[PDB]
Write a protein that binds this DNA or RNA. Structure first.
Ligand code: MG
Ligand code: MG
Ligand code: MG
Ligand code: MG
Ligand code: MG
Lengths: 598, 149, 597, 150
DNA sequence: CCCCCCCCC
DNA sequence: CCCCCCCC
DNA sequence: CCCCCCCC
DNA sequence: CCCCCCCC
């Protein structure tokens, strides 16, 4: 029944290996049988809107976890205050949203706690009746099903009321969590479940309390419980509504029903320091607006056949992209995100010949220079949140017959033509800390083997402060892929960065508790694998006259010296086990060549 | 499509009554140069002007529209406009008097407008300020004929 | 010079006795001579917009400070975390603001620190160039002078960019105060700012979300924060004018605007500040100016004392409508000008004392219209006008308006609108619009309104979700009625004290918890024996309370409560105040809880 | 009818304040579509002085007082106003040329304008280079003319 | 104290 | 030169 | 000419 | 995995 199939989903999700194999990057699997014991690093089962699975994933760390028990490292209390990877992405054309990717250690510390107390989450979730985000887009709980749950919650409503909470994730006071779960008066009196959660959550953001570290499934799960206690307080007051995260739909029929619900709603926000986004408060009167019909979109290619001209397919695809971008302008939320899936599905459904698919996306018209793949590429450069979608779209038409080389050339030519504008855009993303925008360009260059855009001086200028770890890793990979460039200059800019950021901390702080922990692990891993010639390391170390001991060179570059520095080594000893067992957090590639297409 | 690449926004710019208010004596200016024109006959530019005015009783207000010769002369004029703008590292798409300027920073839209207005004042061209508009991504497009066809 | 007048302002403000006598309730005095050694019981020298001076003031505590030195009592470490008075006021008809009135002990600890390190405030203040809010509306630094400063900052500007920070005080992340004063990266590693943060948190029970807003100390702390925001923008060759969180950036080219916005956002993103995108506008020249009061101040330029009293009634009544409509159009603060210019016009036009009584206490037999009843009714449409209305009444009282006639007029209002007022009272309770409640209760105690709430309705005010101030007023209302038995009131107060202590570690001292003001008010009265000690021992024997060396072992007995906590630094502070007969609430001239002349 | 209530008896500060308040009133009036309101600033300030018969030394101090607290000067505000529309170049200069004959010391007029140029030297040069590049002829003429006049 | 009166959080 | 003042 | 059709 | 594709 309903109670049965609910618990199947939750007994599945609440598993430490699942919450890092798919939770760290907020990935989602449709079927349980996709949780293979193999690494399965090449192909994608699940999807995510965040980071490229091929270059950044946990499949190596996951395969370690089902062969080794790591809870030993976390069984103690008093967790370590680690610094996350601050990664800032856009919200509109003129607004932003701040992700924080927590240090893997303090993440697993929080992960194991949530699982050791799965009951305090699950039994509240299954009893809850208003939330359509408590499924986390997981398993068979797709968009049509969350929509269908909302429809039954809005019966009897001549009108609908909308409320959105303003910057809910990033303005959340962490100490509000014991208030919502246990009661504000009960928390004023220590060492409970809510209190221990609060201290583990802040451990992932260097003990700061303004906001939650958003960007992973754990934050999603913790956020859903906080709002499910909201839902429970409103159920006591005999209210009924639908809710997806911070977005409410209250159905009513008389103005007083609305004002009653509005007042009891404000009392809960006042009590828990939540701010109602007033620009988004709206009452919909029947006949009800609904500007989200995808029927016209999904039926765009109805009258096209495999027998249609390759030029016909080119024009219709290009036509279709413009139709959806216009539909998003009219308020059809998600219409642009649908461009990639339906082009993929339509080619498959119409069974276009694999040779004919190459021509469609390879054809550069010598009359107008139009290549439809170039158009899709340029589209994706208009919202860096489309990065994974464009890359999996290429992945799909690639395995359909689009020449990996043809695609690499088209992308190369696009960068060549827009060289001036992209350089200008990079300097902007660097000065104003637009991470994902810089990430997208760097990820495109490493993936499509682009080498003409930046020189070595312009590449080393990327290895600097106020750059996310993901961009640094990508920029490092770009430097290494040119064999002509000498590693000596790269080691200076990297070591200079490592010393500079370690200086801001207390001198007794372990380096794996600091910033740049992911880029640090990436470097130490490549160094232990000796991608950096141990000789070419000693050459640099002697240009700075670095003292030496039995650990090796006393440099931030040497992991063996770093592995011991600091009073609390629980983090260093954590990432130590990972380096020894050659667990990677960044994927070298199929041939370990840092090439990512076939 | 390929001209508008890299643009998170696109600026629209339409000249006002371009065909009917076009000063014929500005045609030599665009092809050769306003300064050079002061120096003054027998040139290709100046003779083209005289063959044009001769079609409309030696009047210089506007070009006689309705035929293809006027379209061709209008393109040549407007292409020397394009070259002056190309020289200044600007990129856009124009159909006759209708410009589409893709950009990403308001600094660019300003740089572009400043030089655009400079050529317009030099050659007695008028911007139709009613049709000036920027489109922010996601871009509107109402020109679709898919459901019609 | 310009810095000559600043240094004199700040050497005066940054004095701990001034910062509580005029800063706790955010008062303002126009002359340094107004800081008299005497307790100004009947002189409202200062101006405030928060709490009625005649009832809630620090003049007695200020008097104790001039004699004793409490810097000795406060020197130490790890300050005690106290719970403030949560007092919620409106922002507009549909919005609210959250004032937090800090425990006196925690407040004074912050006050002494700021003064011992006034150097770190004053040095940044004098050096500042962009802030017109850094004068805190004191001395000869009036609105016209601040506008004159802004005008010279907007020269060379064809356009003005307007930028407002969203919910600034309440959303201000406290730990970001070290970030702005000494840098964020350096803060990863217990200096000046690192301790100012922990003194601030201890005023709001170690909450790090928001600043205790409603007093001068928080305005100065907020000012340092933004004055460092200013130094960062000054290093980038930017010029603008700022008042608290509202910026005006003059510019000419769209280059300069986007240049300014990009840096502005970086500073904001770094310190968890949020920009109110709705109040973001650009004014092109010719510039709008919807805030000119020239027509308001010259409203009475045509009327004289020779004119009929009925004409004065009409022009005043038509003047109130002119200003309320001008506030509608955007002339910000126009309603706040109604009371001053009426008072200043009456004085300047030299209106006789007997005429003022008749102008303001006349009842039209035809229309039942009384102009003072109108002004009162206006004051109840925005509870942030309570102090304005009472100081206005205080002024026409001294000019002739009979205290008796005024009390009768308000009494009549409350009788006509018993239905509505009792609806609004029970509304403000259920939604913690606790200022709107404080106003009604304050009008009742001041104007002697004994016919609105019965005994039961008053007792039902002594509950939770009621702020200390309205609690004190509701208790006063009960006491002002002799026929109400003091026994029932105790049972509501004892139950209330008992219920809020249950929310704490049993080792927590009561004077560190919530309701610290109401507790002090009650304890002071019991020590003064206002609560008949025979009538106290009667109630305790009813509850079968045990009796010990200090007393009857209840929340009501201060001698027992005095020392029942792990950290008694708070109780020991308030105990000294009770012993020396320092009052935080004025019992009145004859201690009859009456406040009219 | 803006200055009708004020007379010679009022303090120079009052006069300075009221004139400063008056410039804002007309500027806002022009913003509302009151065509010509800004061009009326200069005559009615001149003519109000005549009708009210303010003493010569008061004219100097009104237009020379640098308020020690705010460092505000009402003549400097008038000057900054004229640099917002080049077509006010003559109506500002006749205004000075008028109050110069009313008792305003030219040595102070020159000193006040020179301070403005010293203060906004970066901005003014930035604006000059922008006028040459875009062939804005009157805007440049204004700055150059103020330089030679003052 | 010796005319004024208004911005915010 | 003998009160004013502003439209294009 | 050999499943298109529309912009100033 | 066995006519789907989209919300924060
Ligand atoms: Mg939101
Ligand atoms: Mg046209
Ligand atoms: Mg604000
Ligand atoms: Mg504000
Ligand atoms: Mg046209």
């Amino acid at each position: 029944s309903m109670k049965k199939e609910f618990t199947e989903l939750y007994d599945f999700i609440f598993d430490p290996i699942f919450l890092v194999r798919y939770g760290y990057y907020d990935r989602s699997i449709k079927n349980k049988k996709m949780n293979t014991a193999k690494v399965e690093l090449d192909n994608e089962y699940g999807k995510s809107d965040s980071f490229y699975f091929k270059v950044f994933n946990m499949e190596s760390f996951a395969d370690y976890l089902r062969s080794h028990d790591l809870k030993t490292h976390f069984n103690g209390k008093k967790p370590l205050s680690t610094d996350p990877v601050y990664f800032n992405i856009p919200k509109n054309i003129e607004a932003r949203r701040q992700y924080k990717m927590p240090n893997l250690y303090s993440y697993m510390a929080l992960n194991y706690y949530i699982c050791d107390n799965k009951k305090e989450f699950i039994e509240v979730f299954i009893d809850n009746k208003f939330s359509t985000s408590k499924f986390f887009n997981q398993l068979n709980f797709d968009y049509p099903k969350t929509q269908e749950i909302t429809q039954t919650l809005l019966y009897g409503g001549i009108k609908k009321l909308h409320l959105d909470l303003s910057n809910f994730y990033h303005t959340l006071y962490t100490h509000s969590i014991p208030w919502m779960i246990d009661g504000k008066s009960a928390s004023k009196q220590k060492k409970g479940f809510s209190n221990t959660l609060d201290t583990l959550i802040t451990a992932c953001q260097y003990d700061e309390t303004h906001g939650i570290p958003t960007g992973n499934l754990l934050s999603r799960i913790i956020t859903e419980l906080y709002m499910c206690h909201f839902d429970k307080q409103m159920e006591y007051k005999k209210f009924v509504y639908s809710r997806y995260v911070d977005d409410f739909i209250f159905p009513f029929t008389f103005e007083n029903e609305k004002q009653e619900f509005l007042n009891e709603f404000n009392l809960i926000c006042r009590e828990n320091n939540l701010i109602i986004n007033d620009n988004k408060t709206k009452v919909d009167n029947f006949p009800f607006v609904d500007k989200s019909s995808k029927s016209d979109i999904f039926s765009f290619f109805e009258n096209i056949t495999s027998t249609n001209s390759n030029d016909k397919w080119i024009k219709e695809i290009s036509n279709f992209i413009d139709y959806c971008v216009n539909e998003e302008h009219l308020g059809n939320k998600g219409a642009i995100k649908c461009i990639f899936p339906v082009i993929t599905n339509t080619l498959k459904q119409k069974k276009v010949d694999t040779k004919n698919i190459d021509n469609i996306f390879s054809k550069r018209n010598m009359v107008t220079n139009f290549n439809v793949f170039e158009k899709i590429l340029d589209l994706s450069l208009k919202d860096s949140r489309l990065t994974n979608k464009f890359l999996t779209f290429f992945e799909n038409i690639n395995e359909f017959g689009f020449s990996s080389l043809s695609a690499s050339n088209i992308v190369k030519k696009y960068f060549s033509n827009n060289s001036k504008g992209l350089k200008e855009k990079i300097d902007h993303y660097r000065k104003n800390n637009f991470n994902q925008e810089l990430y997208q360009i760097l990820l495109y260059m490493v993936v499509f083997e682009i080498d003409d855009l930046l020189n070595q001086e312009e590449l080393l200028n990327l290895i600097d402060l106020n750059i996310d770890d993901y961009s640094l890793i990508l920029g490092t990979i770009l430097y290494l892929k040119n064999s002509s460039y000498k590693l000596e200059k790269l080691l200076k800019k990297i070591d200079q960065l490592f010393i500079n950021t370690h200086a801001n901390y207390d001198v007794k702080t372990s380096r794996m508790a600091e910033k740049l922990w992911l880029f640090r692990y990436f470097f130490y891993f490549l160094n232990c694998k000796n991608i950096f010639s141990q000789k070419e390391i000693n050459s640099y170390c002697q240009s700075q006259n670095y003292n030496s001991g039995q650990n090796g060179y006393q440099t931030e570059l040497n992991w063996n010296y770093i592995k011991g520095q600091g009073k609390d080594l629980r983090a260093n000893n954590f990432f130590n086990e990972l380096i020894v067992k050659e667990v990677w957090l960044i994927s070298c590639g199929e041939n370990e060549d840092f090439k990512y297409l076939n | 499509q390929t001209l508008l690449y890299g643009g998170i926004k696109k600026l629209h710019l339409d000249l006002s009554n371009f065909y009917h208010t076009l000063y014929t004596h500005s045609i030599p200016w665009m092809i050769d140069g306003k300064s050079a024109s002061k120096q003054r006959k027998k040139g290709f530019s100046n003779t083209l002007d005289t063959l044009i005015t001769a079609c409309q009783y030696d009047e210089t207000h506007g070009i006689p529209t309705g035929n293809l010769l006027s379209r061709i002369i209008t393109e040549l004029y407007m292409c020397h406009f394009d070259k002056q703008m190309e020289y200044k590292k600007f990129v856009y798409s124009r159909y006759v008097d209708d410009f589409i300027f893709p950009f990403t920073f308001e600094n660019e839209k300003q740089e572009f407008l400043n030089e655009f207005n400079l050529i317009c004042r030099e050659n007695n061209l008028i911007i139709n300020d009613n049709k000036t508009k920027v489109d922010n991504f996601p871009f509107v497009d109402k020109s679709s004929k898919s459901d019609i066809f």
